[PDB]
Design a binder for these strands. Sequence first.
RNA 1: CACCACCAGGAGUGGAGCCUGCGGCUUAAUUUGACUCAACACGGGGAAACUCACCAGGUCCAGACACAAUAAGGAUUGACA
Length: 121
Amino acid sequence: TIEDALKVVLRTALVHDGLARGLRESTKALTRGEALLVVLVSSVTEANIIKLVEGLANDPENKVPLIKVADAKQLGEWAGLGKIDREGNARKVVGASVVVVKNWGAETDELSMIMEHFSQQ
RNA sequence: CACCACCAGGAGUGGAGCCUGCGGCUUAAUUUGACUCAACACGGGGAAACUCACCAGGUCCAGACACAAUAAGGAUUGACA
Ligand SMILES: [Mg+2]
Ligand SMILES: [Mg+2]
Ligand SMILES: [Mg+2]
Ligand SMILES: [Mg+2]
């Protein structure tokens, strides 16, 4: 439970339609006040998705949430991309790089837990 | 036995001009069914479009669902001039 509970803050976020999944979507979404928590890959390739979304979320005003995690293929199952098959093993999905969140669909204590790790260590 | 037969009759039709239905001819198409009574102002069929089925052209999917493929560093949709 050492900071891999970001799945459950994302999973309750999806049920209240609050993930602007996708490089195009996220970049559009976080170029407004919608940017509420952001999740990034470490690096996929060629370093420029890494440059681009970081510079937009590093604006000179308060809107700087940023969380740095591992490769994208896991991350799509960490978000909602449907591969349930009513819990069956089959992965029919792809992996996203940048998920930006709006409104997080919840009141979770893990939601309480997560920002504090984002704030204090 | 019977004016969907005759008798004694009446009013006609068949002639004419138009209206309408069928065959034919023509047509890109002149959509089609029904040929004695028991087909032919019949399909309640008096069709400008629609009806509409025919002809000449142009859109759309309104091809459920399942399994594969594709694919959030975009599977696909819409459009101003
Ligand atoms: Mg006459
Ligand atoms: Mg007729
Ligand atoms: Mg007729
Ligand atoms: Mg037709």
